Amino acid sequence: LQLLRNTRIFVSTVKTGHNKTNTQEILVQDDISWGQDSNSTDITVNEAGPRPTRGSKRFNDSLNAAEWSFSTYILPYKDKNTSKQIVPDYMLWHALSSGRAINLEGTTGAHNNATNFMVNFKDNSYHELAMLHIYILTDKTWSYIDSCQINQAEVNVDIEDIGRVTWSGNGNQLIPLDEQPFDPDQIGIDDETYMTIQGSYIKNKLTILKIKDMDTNKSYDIPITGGTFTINNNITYLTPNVMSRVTIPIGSFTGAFELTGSLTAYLNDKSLGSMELYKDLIKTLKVVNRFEIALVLGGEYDDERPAAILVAKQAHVNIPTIETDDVLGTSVEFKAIPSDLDAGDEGYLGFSSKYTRTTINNLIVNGDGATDAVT
Amino acid sequence: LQLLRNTRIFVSTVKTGHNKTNTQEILVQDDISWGQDSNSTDITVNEAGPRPTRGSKRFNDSLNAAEWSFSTYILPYKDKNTSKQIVPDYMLWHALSSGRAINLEGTTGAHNNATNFMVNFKDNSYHELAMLHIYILTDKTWSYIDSCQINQAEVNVDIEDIGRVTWSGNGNQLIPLDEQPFDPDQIGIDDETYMTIQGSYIKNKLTILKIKDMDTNKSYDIPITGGTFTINNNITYLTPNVMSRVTIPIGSFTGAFELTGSLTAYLNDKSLGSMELYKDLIKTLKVVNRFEIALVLGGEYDDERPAAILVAKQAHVNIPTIETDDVLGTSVEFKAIPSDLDAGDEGYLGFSSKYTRTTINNLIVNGDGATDAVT
Amino acid sequence: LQLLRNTRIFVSTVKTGHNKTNTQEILVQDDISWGQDSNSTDITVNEAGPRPTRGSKRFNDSLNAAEWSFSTYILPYKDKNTSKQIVPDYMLWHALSSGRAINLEGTTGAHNNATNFMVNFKDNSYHELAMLHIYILTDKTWSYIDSCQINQAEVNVDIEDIGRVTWSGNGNQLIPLDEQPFDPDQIGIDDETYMTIQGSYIKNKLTILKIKDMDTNKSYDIPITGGTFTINNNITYLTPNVMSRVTIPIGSFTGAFELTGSLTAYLNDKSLGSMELYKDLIKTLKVVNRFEIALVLGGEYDDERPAAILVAKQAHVNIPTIETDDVLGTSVEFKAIPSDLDAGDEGYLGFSSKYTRTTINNLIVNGDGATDAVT
């Protein structure tokens, strides 16, 4: 028998070669779900005779796209090889953010500094976004999915649980493989790295919102009681239709990048509170809203603390809806809107093991934690 | 913070002026739900190029109709000012039943007497039925919904709970207001009224059904084990479509009055029992059924007891369906059908704190508790 | 009052005459659900006037098909009158499998020997498959459903509960019959038969799968951890449309015979295991798969044990899907495909109180439990 407790998920770019730089291990939770489905057509005969021909041949006409959704953690840890903080699943973020292949240093989709690891969507303008091969250890069978381009990355601010993203991706085909592709233990998570990983956890009870109105330069102090965040590169797979053969999908195309999320907060009648935001949105009706929303999973402490900051420079905010709990709270929905519909300006993510108030403010102002005017 | 325990819902007829006659307080339960939604259109670009333009501007194009649904009680209490028994939410019943403004004495939609308060739908043939403004205390903020026209009033005979109606209405717009419209303490429920309110409760375990066949003059003795009742003035809101502005709904129109309900009873094989009704409906198939259905929430006692009587002079009754519980019970559905499709003859509700058998018979036969032949 | 504990369901072939040969009693569980519904059209008026005509006459225009679904057991017991083992509900299986009336001895849909009772689907080429009248004793009322042709029979291998089938059929009409059609106690289950019934139970924890690949002559050792099986004679009832009358359905027609099921098993990496089947199905993509699936509700023992064998000579098997439980298991779906779309070769069922390994192999190889080559 094979146990789910022993499952390992490895992410790689090339089929043949396999070293620690090109592929690593993902510290998946017990939410893994993969598989493939087929489109089957049933042929039935319906003729008006005295003796009907009751039968139905079934034909497999095409294959769908292989689907996988594992739920790893948010673990920004310092890299021993080069003093630049890297999350264990940086390649998944890169495949989400850019089509160019693994340019860690050069400012692109997956750019990391000594201080901060940060994810830009400026280069997210390609079809077939950074094909990645994912190897899954169903105990000891080594089954992988070929050419996985990821579809969704969802952060859920559970307000009472550790930071965890839930990836989703549409692979071309799921291939079992009799033999091992590479060496598991050497490639996957060493103990020395695992120590920093265990030290880099994010609580999500220290999340603080920084909603600001670009129209009026008004900043709101909102205590988040829960929220949701999702990135959805809408991938639709093109499958040729051959009548007498079983066809696998070819190509993946793309859709509309949707950096979207939801934010829930309690109703406070103080100044620059949640109720003031509700009144501002309900009283003034605007076709387009311009908000700067900063989701900092960690706190903004005058100390080195792990955090997974999020920013959306301009984000349309829907009308808040009053939710009647024991203590009333409003849930706002926000969808990042790129500028000029060409450049990637929806937002960017920042992961690092050490975040301070100054560095968080730096990333909020400009892309990295380099400088900030600060009066 | 703002708590749901302190919520108060005030129903008013006029905006500026505010006295005890024009508006009162509704003793709502903890099922309040109000809010507004907006229709947002997302613009995406899908062109066949080497570099796709992955972006999506989002626009707010129109506003929907504000939705509110609180669940108050059925509390017919005698009025100190005039000796006519009035429910605390009488003008809500009036807005359900008529468009003319609060003609309490004159026989219309909300007609009251010393003996009975009754709700007639004879004048329920207007568009824009009796606009009412509803003020909501989310703790202390005084946010209201402008020009609420109620949509549904549902009575649920739970058999084990106090009589409670669950209103629903589609308001034009939700306006927060910084300041108080009126004085909450003087306008809403005084202690002297509250005493009679506590004294006028309806148990719902004393309900008795009085189904009679107008075709065959056959009366059935049915012990109700549960049931449902709903009045639905279908309201669809007309919103202008302006491309470059956010439009709020103008006007409300009106649809088909639907006094509908469901009744469940155990299967008794006695004479004039539920099984006899089932056999009568299943054996004889008629295009139109004519039944007189009377739902008396209180009991018919030789004494003064509170009750919330319903009568439907002619009501089409669907075919009963056998529900296989531990003890088998049939569920019948009935929808009151008006005569001539012009006058309001679907039915009428009778609320009062003191009902006797004679008064219940009076209201079942004729409109009020004046006289009945009984020879 | 009437209790569900006393409900008895009798299955009969003829209306007037009633003996033990024509009808018996079905040992139904507490899942009985019968009833009838009607198609009602509501007429509403929507005209643009200052005074809308708010009203809605409701008309009953037609009747649907009466629906019933009881859940009896799988109880193959030896018949005292003739030494041929017969299940208590053999008429239901006969109506499922054939249109010709009760040829128990010879070769048809319900063909039984001294060894095995069997359900053959070769003769399911008729509309209006073997009309049966089912009498339901809701305590003491004796109401039946007229001309019931069954639509579905489902076997659920719960892996921890006794074998039980869940019939479903669309009867023409539900008729009360205040008087008794026949004598209940004499017709239904005597104590002597009930003893063998208590002796004939099937545990379902001894089920064995015998998937074999007709293409490659490869046999898989698969331990079932659960599964499903269903036979679905798609019955669509033709109801005439008369405007001014209530019409009951006339005729029943028939659809495509669908012997379908599902199989769930744990992932074993042994030889000829579930993992081998998964690899064979996922690595090789074929338009049509030809599998011989033999699902025995009982076990194969070198002794006389009750069992309910099932076989599908040609069964298309869909692509297995990995289910991520604590121990990973794959769920395969299989739909029997008849040969030439004219003869009934989807499969056949075998019920008997005594199966040995030799008799099970007999029924798997050829139709009867007579001989098999074995050398």
Side-chain angles (χ1 to χ4, degrees):
Chain A
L1 281 72
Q2 293 172 344
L3 294 172
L4 198 73
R5 296 195 56 96
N6 305 334
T7 54
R8 293 178 182 269
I9 287 189
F10 294 92
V11 168
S12 177
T13 312
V14 64
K15 285 177 176 181
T16 43
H18 282 301
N19 58 6
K20 217 180 180 305
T21 299
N22 200 337
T23 179
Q24 60 273 8
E25 185 202 350
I26 311 302
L27 281 171
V28 289
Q29 288 182 350
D30 303 335
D31 292 335
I32 297 169
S33 178
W34 77 100
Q36 195 165 5
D37 194 0
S38 64
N39 296 351
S40 43
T41 63
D42 299 337
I43 299 298
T44 60
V45 188
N46 182 75
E47 49 179 335
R51 298 290 297 273
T53 64
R54 302 187 56 235
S56 52
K57 294 179 192 168
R58 157 176 292 186
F59 298 105
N60 296 10
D61 267 339
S62 86
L63 263 184
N64 274 349
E67 296 173 353
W68 48 270
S69 62
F70 60 82
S71 308
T72 185
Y73 267 121
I74 313 180
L75 309 160
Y77 72 91
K78 183 182 177 178
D79 199 2
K80 279 321 171 293
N81 295 344
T82 47
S83 59
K84 298 170 176 179
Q85 278 164 0
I86 299 292
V87 303
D89 55 353
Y90 70 98
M91 301 175 78
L92 284 150
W93 282 109
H94 156 266
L96 182 82
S97 74
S98 80
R100 67 178 65 254
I102 317 298
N103 208 329
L104 267 293
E105 60 183 2
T107 71
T108 185
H111 160 271
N112 51 297
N113 279 351
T115 314
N116 264 207
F117 179 54
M118 51 76 88
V119 184
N120 273 337
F121 305 107
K122 301 185 177 174
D123 202 3
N124 190 357
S125 55
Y126 298 124
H127 317 284
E128 294 174 324
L129 273 162
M131 311 215 178
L132 295 191
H133 311 278
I134 291 173
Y135 297 88
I136 321 168
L137 274 169
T138 183
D139 211 332
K140 171 46 181 82
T141 317
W142 269 126
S143 192
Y144 79 97
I145 315 167
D146 175 27
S147 296
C148 295
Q149 329 183 352
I150 68 164
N151 190 2
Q152 216 178 3
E154 315 171 26
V155 186
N156 204 70
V157 181
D158 202 359
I159 225 62
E160 281 178 351
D161 276 326
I162 311 299
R164 50 188 286 276
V165 300
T166 60
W167 309 90
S168 178
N170 273 355
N172 279 317
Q173 191 177 358
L174 171 63
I175 299 184
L177 294 175
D178 294 331
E179 299 187 19
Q180 306 191 163
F182 48 91
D183 197 72
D185 57 357
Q186 188 274 331
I187 292 297
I189 292 291
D190 291 356
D191 201 62
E192 55 92 18
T193 300
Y194 193 50
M195 282 334 284
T196 318
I197 292 170
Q198 291 225 339
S200 89
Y201 282 112
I202 312 173
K203 289 175 69 176
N204 281 129
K205 191 133 186 183
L206 320 174
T207 73
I208 190 167
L209 209 44
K210 287 195 171 190
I211 289 179
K212 189 204 177 194
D213 280 21
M214 298 300 215
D215 301 333
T216 64
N217 297 267
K218 193 176 176 187
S219 51
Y220 299 93
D221 303 328
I222 281 177
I224 288 174
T225 188
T228 295
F229 164 67
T230 185
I231 299 159
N232 189 358
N233 312 325
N234 281 344
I235 298 295
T236 61
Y237 263 74
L238 190 145
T239 71
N241 275 331
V242 176
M243 293 180 183
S244 47
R245 290 182 184 272
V246 176
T247 50
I248 64 171
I250 65 176
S252 71
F253 264 70
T254 65
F257 175 91
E258 294 177 39
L259 196 144
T260 315
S262 162
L263 302 168
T264 65
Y266 283 167
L267 270 191
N268 277 325
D269 53 321
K270 47 164 184 175
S271 66
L272 307 170
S274 51
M275 201 85 168
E276 295 272 336
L277 194 151
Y278 180 42
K279 289 175 176 170
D280 286 11
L281 291 189
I282 204 75
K283 268 183 175 176
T284 62
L285 295 170
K286 327 174 199 168
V287 186
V288 190
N289 289 327
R290 304 194 41 241
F291 279 46
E292 168 198 299
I293 284 160
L295 274 167
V296 191
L297 294 203
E300 43 182 334
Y301 295 131
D302 299 0
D303 192 10
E304 284 186 335
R305 295 305 210 74
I309 190 167
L310 179 154
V311 289
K313 302 303 290 180
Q314 62 273 15
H316 189 88
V317 171
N318 289 17
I319 293 171
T321 61
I322 293 191
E323 297 185 341
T324 45
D325 291 332
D326 290 14
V327 188
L328 281 76
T330 61
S331 167
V332 306
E333 293 179 354
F334 72 104
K335 183 202 175 183
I337 291 178
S339 64
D340 205 5
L341 288 172
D342 283 348
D345 291 329
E346 292 98 354
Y348 47 102
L349 275 299
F351 307 90
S352 76
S353 175
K354 308 158 187 174
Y355 264 117
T356 53
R357 198 155 308 180
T358 51
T359 311
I360 286 170
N361 193 34
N362 289 0
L363 190 149
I364 292 190
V365 178
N366 61 6
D368 280 315
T371 61
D372 194 327
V374 72
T375 77
Chain B
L1 292 165
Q2 293 171 345
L3 293 147
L4 200 66
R5 296 195 55 96
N6 304 334
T7 53
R8 293 178 181 269
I9 285 177
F10 293 91
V11 169
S12 177
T13 311
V14 63
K15 283 179 176 181
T16 43
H18 282 300
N19 58 6
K20 219 179 181 306
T21 299
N22 289 0
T23 179
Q24 57 270 15
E25 184 202 351
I26 313 303
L27 282 170
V28 295
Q29 288 183 350
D30 303 335
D31 292 336
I32 297 169
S33 178
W34 75 100
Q36 195 166 6
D37 194 359
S38 64
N39 296 351
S40 43
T41 62
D42 299 338
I43 304 303
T44 61
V45 188
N46 182 75
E47 48 180 335
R51 288 197 83 101
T53 63
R54 291 155 54 70
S56 51
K57 293 180 191 168
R58 157 177 292 187
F59 298 105
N60 295 11
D61 267 339
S62 86
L63 262 185
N64 273 348
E67 296 174 353
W68 58 262
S69 62
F70 62 84
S71 308
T72 185
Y73 269 121
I74 315 179
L75 313 165
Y77 72 92
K78 183 183 177 178
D79 200 3
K80 284 322 171 303
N81 296 344
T82 45
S83 59
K84 300 170 177 179
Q85 282 170 4
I86 302 294
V87 302
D89 54 354
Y90 68 96
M91 64 183 73
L92 282 149
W93 281 110
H94 140 270
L96 180 82
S97 75
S98 81
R100 66 179 66 253
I102 318 297
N103 204 347
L104 294 174
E105 59 184 2
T107 71
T108 185
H111 163 271
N112 61 33
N113 276 351
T115 314
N116 296 312
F117 181 55
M118 66 181 180
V119 185
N120 272 336
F121 305 108
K122 301 184 178 174
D123 201 4
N124 189 358
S125 55
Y126 296 124
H127 318 284
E128 293 173 324
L129 294 174
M131 293 180 183
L132 297 191
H133 312 278
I134 294 171
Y135 296 88
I136 299 168
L137 294 174
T138 183
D139 211 332
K140 199 289 171 183
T141 300
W142 269 126
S143 191
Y144 78 97
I145 306 168
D146 175 27
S147 296
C148 298
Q149 298 180 1
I150 62 170
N151 189 359
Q152 216 180 3
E154 314 170 26
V155 183
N156 205 70
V157 182
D158 203 0
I159 285 284
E160 282 176 352
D161 277 325
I162 311 300
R164 51 190 286 277
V165 298
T166 60
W167 308 88
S168 178
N170 273 357
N172 280 318
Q173 191 179 358
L174 193 151
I175 315 166
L177 294 175
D178 292 331
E179 299 187 19
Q180 306 190 163
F182 47 90
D183 206 347
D185 55 355
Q186 311 150 18
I187 293 297
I189 303 299
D190 292 356
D191 200 62
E192 178 65 29
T193 300
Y194 195 51
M195 281 335 287
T196 317
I197 287 171
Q198 311 273 119
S200 88
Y201 277 36
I202 311 174
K203 254 193 71 163
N204 287 122
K205 205 150 185 286
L206 320 173
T207 74
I208 190 167
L209 185 55
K210 283 196 167 189
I211 284 182
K212 189 204 177 193
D213 281 21
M214 311 275 278
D215 301 334
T216 65
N217 298 268
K218 193 175 177 187
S219 51
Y220 299 91
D221 303 328
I222 285 175
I224 290 174
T225 191
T228 305
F229 175 73
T230 180
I231 302 161
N232 188 357
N233 312 326
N234 283 344
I235 301 294
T236 61
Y237 264 75
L238 190 145
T239 71
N241 275 331
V242 176
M243 311 206 168
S244 47
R245 267 165 43 180
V246 176
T247 61
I248 64 171
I250 67 165
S252 70
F253 264 74
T254 301
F257 181 90
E258 295 178 38
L259 188 152
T260 314
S262 161
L263 294 171
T264 65
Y266 285 164
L267 266 190
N268 295 312
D269 52 320
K270 47 164 185 174
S271 66
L272 307 170
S274 50
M275 181 145 288
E276 294 273 337
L277 193 151
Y278 181 42
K279 290 175 176 170
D280 286 11
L281 291 189
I282 203 74
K283 267 183 174 176
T284 62
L285 295 170
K286 328 174 198 168
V287 174
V288 190
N289 282 327
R290 276 193 61 231
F291 279 45
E292 167 199 299
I293 286 160
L295 285 178
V296 183
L297 291 203
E300 41 186 356
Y301 297 131
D302 299 1
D303 192 10
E304 285 185 335
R305 295 306 208 74
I309 189 168
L310 163 71
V311 286
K313 304 304 289 180
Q314 62 273 14
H316 189 88
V317 173
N318 289 16
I319 288 150
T321 61
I322 294 191
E323 296 185 341
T324 46
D325 291 331
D326 290 14
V327 186
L328 282 77
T330 60
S331 167
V332 306
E333 293 179 354
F334 71 103
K335 184 201 175 182
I337 60 170
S339 64
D340 178 21
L341 289 172
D342 284 347
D345 306 327
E346 292 100 355
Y348 48 104
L349 276 301
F351 306 92
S352 132
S353 175
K354 308 158 187 174
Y355 273 81
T356 61
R357 199 156 308 180
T358 51
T359 300
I360 290 170
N361 191 34
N362 286 359
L363 193 150
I364 291 189
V365 179
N366 44 289
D368 274 314
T371 55
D372 60 319
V374 124
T375 183
Chain C
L1 281 72
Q2 294 171 345
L3 282 74
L4 201 73
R5 295 195 55 96
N6 306 334
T7 54
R8 324 180 80 191
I9 287 189
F10 293 91
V11 167
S12 177
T13 310
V14 64
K15 283 179 175 181
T16 63
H18 282 300
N19 58 6
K20 218 179 181 306
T21 300
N22 289 1
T23 179
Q24 49 269 26
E25 186 201 351
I26 308 312
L27 280 169
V28 291
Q29 287 182 349
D30 302 334
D31 292 336
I32 297 169
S33 178
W34 76 100
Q36 195 165 6
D37 191 74
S38 64
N39 297 350
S40 43
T41 81
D42 299 337
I43 305 303
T44 60
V45 188
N46 183 75
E47 49 181 335
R51 303 300 282 305
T53 63
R54 309 214 324 154
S56 51
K57 293 179 191 168
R58 157 177 293 187
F59 299 106
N60 295 11
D61 267 340
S62 86
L63 264 184
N64 273 349
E67 296 173 352
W68 48 269
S69 61
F70 58 87
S71 309
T72 185
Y73 271 123
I74 314 181
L75 311 162
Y77 71 92
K78 182 183 178 178
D79 200 3
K80 298 293 183 182
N81 294 344
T82 46
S83 60
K84 299 170 176 179
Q85 282 169 4
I86 298 292
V87 304
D89 55 353
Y90 70 96
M91 269 167 298
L92 285 149
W93 283 109
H94 156 266
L96 181 82
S97 74
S98 81
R100 66 178 65 253
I102 301 299
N103 206 328
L104 265 291
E105 61 182 2
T107 70
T108 185
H111 160 269
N112 52 296
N113 294 160
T115 315
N116 297 312
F117 179 55
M118 294 182 286
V119 183
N120 271 335
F121 302 109
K122 301 185 177 173
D123 202 3
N124 50 56
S125 54
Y126 299 118
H127 317 284
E128 294 174 324
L129 273 163
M131 277 150 191
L132 297 190
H133 311 278
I134 292 172
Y135 296 88
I136 298 169
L137 272 170
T138 183
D139 211 332
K140 174 39 171 72
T141 306
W142 268 125
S143 191
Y144 71 96
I145 312 168
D146 176 27
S147 296
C148 295
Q149 328 184 352
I150 63 170
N151 164 81
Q152 216 181 4
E154 314 170 25
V155 183
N156 205 70
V157 181
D158 203 359
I159 224 69
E160 281 178 351
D161 276 325
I162 311 299
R164 50 190 287 277
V165 298
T166 60
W167 309 88
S168 178
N170 274 355
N172 279 317
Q173 191 177 358
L174 180 42
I175 299 184
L177 311 193
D178 61 357
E179 298 189 19
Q180 304 191 163
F182 49 91
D183 197 323
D185 60 358
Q186 308 152 16
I187 292 297
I189 307 307
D190 293 356
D191 202 62
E192 179 72 344
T193 301
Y194 193 51
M195 281 335 297
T196 318
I197 292 170
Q198 296 294 321
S200 180
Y201 282 110
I202 315 174
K203 211 181 153 201
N204 273 330
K205 199 138 195 286
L206 319 174
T207 73
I208 54 148
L209 191 58
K210 286 197 170 191
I211 285 182
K212 189 204 178 193
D213 281 22
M214 303 288 248
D215 301 334
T216 65
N217 297 267
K218 194 175 176 187
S219 51
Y220 299 90
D221 185 74
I222 288 172
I224 295 171
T225 191
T228 311
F229 164 68
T230 180
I231 300 160
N232 188 357
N233 311 324
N234 281 344
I235 301 295
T236 81
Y237 265 74
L238 189 145
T239 71
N241 276 331
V242 176
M243 293 180 183
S244 47
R245 276 171 172 74
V246 175
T247 59
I248 63 171
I250 56 168
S252 71
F253 264 70
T254 317
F257 181 92
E258 294 178 38
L259 195 144
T260 314
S262 162
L263 295 173
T264 65
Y266 285 166
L267 269 190
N268 290 319
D269 52 320
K270 46 164 184 175
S271 66
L272 307 170
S274 51
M275 185 64 72
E276 294 273 337
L277 175 63
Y278 183 43
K279 289 175 177 169
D280 285 11
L281 293 182
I282 202 74
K283 267 183 174 176
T284 60
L285 295 171
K286 328 173 199 168
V287 187
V288 190
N289 301 340
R290 283 193 50 232
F291 278 42
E292 167 199 299
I293 286 160
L295 192 152
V296 185
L297 276 297
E300 51 207 7
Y301 295 131
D302 299 1
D303 192 11
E304 285 185 335
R305 294 290 221 297
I309 190 167
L310 183 155
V311 289
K313 304 304 289 181
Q314 313 104 40
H316 191 88
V317 172
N318 289 17
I319 291 170
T321 61
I322 287 163
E323 297 186 342
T324 46
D325 292 331
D326 290 14
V327 187
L328 282 76
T330 59
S331 168
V332 308
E333 294 179 354
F334 71 102
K335 185 201 176 182
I337 290 178
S339 64
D340 195 22
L341 289 173
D342 284 348
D345 305 327
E346 291 101 355
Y348 47 101
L349 273 298
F351 306 90
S352 139
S353 175
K354 314 152 191 303
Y355 283 84
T356 61
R357 199 154 307 180
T358 51
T359 300
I360 289 170
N361 192 34
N362 286 358
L363 192 149
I364 291 186
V365 178
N366 60 6
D368 283 315
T371 56
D372 63 313
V374 81
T375 192

